[PDB]
Amino acid sequence: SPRSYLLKELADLSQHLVRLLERLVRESERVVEVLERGEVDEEELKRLEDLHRELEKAVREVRETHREIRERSR
Amino acid sequence: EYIIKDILDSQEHLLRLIEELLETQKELLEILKRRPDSVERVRELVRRSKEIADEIRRQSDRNVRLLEEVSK
C-alpha cells in the first residue's frame, strides 16, 4: 500500500497541476486584453509571476513523487 | 511487466508537454512586461497555449485513470 498512497497522491498532484496551468492560460489571456487597452497596473503581471512560481514548485514535487515511486519499485 | 514504468514514462512525457506550456507562457509574460507595440506574437502564444493545455488535460485525465486502476 505504500505505493498505493503514492500513486493516489501522484494523481492528486497531477490534477492540481493541470487546474493551475488552465488558470494561468486563462489569466494570461486576460492580461493581454488589459495591455490592449493600456491599463496595465503591475499587479496583474505580479499575479502571473506568482502563478509561474507556484507551477514550477508543483512540477518539482511531481518529480520528487516519481523518485519516491521509483525507489519503492526496485 | 513494467506497469509502473509505463505510468512513469507517460508522466514524464506529460511533464515535457507541461514544460513546453510553461516556456510558452514565460515568453508571453516576458514580452508583456516590456509593453510591446504589437500583440501579434502574444496573441499567437495565447492560441498555442490553449492548444497545448487542451492536450495536457486529455493526457493527465488518462494518466489519472491509469493511476487509480493500478492502486486498487
Residue B24's CB: how many other CB atoms inside 10 A?
20
- Domain span including residue B62: 1-72
- Number of independent structural domains in chain B: 1
With vertex at residue B42, the alpha carbon angle to CA B40 and CA B46, rounded to the nearest 5 degrees, is 115
A contact set with B (CB within 8 A) = 3-4, 7-8, 10-11, 14-15, 17-18, 21-22, 24-25, 28-29, 31-32, 35-36, 40, 45, 48-49, 52, 55-56, 59, 62-63, 66, 69-70, 73
Cell of A72: 519503492
Which candidate, B45, B3, B49, B33, places its Cα nearest to that of A24?
Answer: B49
CA dist B31 and B36 (Å) reads 7
Integer CA distances (angstroms), B15 to A18, A59, B8, B34, in order: 11, 8, 10, 29
Technique of determination: X-ray
How many residue contacts between A and B have a Cβ separation below 8 Å?
Answer: 94
Q: Which of B29, B39, B56 sits opposite A18 (nearest CB)?
A: B56
The resolution, in angstroms to one decimal, equals: 1.8
Name which of B25, B67, B68 is nearest A24 (Cβ-Cβ): B25
